[PDB]
């Protein structure tokens, strides 16, 4: 484990902050489950509860931001930097085709509110190069 990078430092904060639904500075299972999808992590139901069980030394099933920060931190660095990539690919692929087309890209471009061939050599392989 390294000193965690600033760029990722914010992402953690943003995750926690952006997805505290009821806005009580804690996350509970439901919030925690969505909070981690923002950092790419998608863990088994069992697993998630497991975590809340571990760091809720507070009693009554919640997670302080500090604990949260500590955790996702190790997860981000200790993560296969290619699994990071793998999920990203899995997410553009709505139709589960195997190759990203524009109906799965403008799909994103639009869902946030030129250079078509830019990084095209014709898949997961061309991906990592970016």
């Amino acid at each position: 484990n390294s000193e965690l990078l600033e760029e990722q430092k914010q992402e953690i904060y943003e995750a926690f902050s952006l997805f505290d639904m009821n806005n009580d500075g804690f996350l509970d299972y439901h919030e925690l489950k969505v909070a981690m999808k923002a950092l790419g992590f998608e863990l088994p139901k069992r697993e998630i509860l497991d975590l809340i069980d571990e760091y809720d030394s507070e009693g009554r099933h919640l997670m302080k931001y500090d604990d949260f920060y500590i955790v996702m931190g190790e997860k981000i660095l200790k993560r296969d930097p290619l699994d990071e990539i793998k999920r990203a690919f899995q997410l553009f692929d709505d139709d589960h085709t195997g190759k990203i087309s524009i109906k799965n890209l403008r799909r994103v471009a639009k869902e946030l509110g030129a250079m078509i061939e830019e990084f095209d050599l014709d898949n997961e392989n061309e991906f990592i190069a970016i």
């Binding site: 943003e14 489950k33 969505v34 923002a38 999920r87 990203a88 553009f92």
Partner: protein, 83 residues
Amino acid sequence: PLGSNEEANRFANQAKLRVQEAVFYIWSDKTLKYSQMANDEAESFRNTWLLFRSFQQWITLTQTFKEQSRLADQAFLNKMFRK
């Protein structure tokens, strides 16, 4: 043909009757049943409202978490989006 005008009194006892039933029925037949009738409509209300409240709390949360979840993936791309 036969009989007296003690029958005038056999006609009071009878008039007092058309009124006994009258007030007995509006008491019972009409008025007292509403104690059972609406008593039920009361349970049925309570009940329905009880359901509605809980169900609406259930479903809208589910809706939020779905809707949030699909925004978390949205979010997670926005970093890698700028290459």
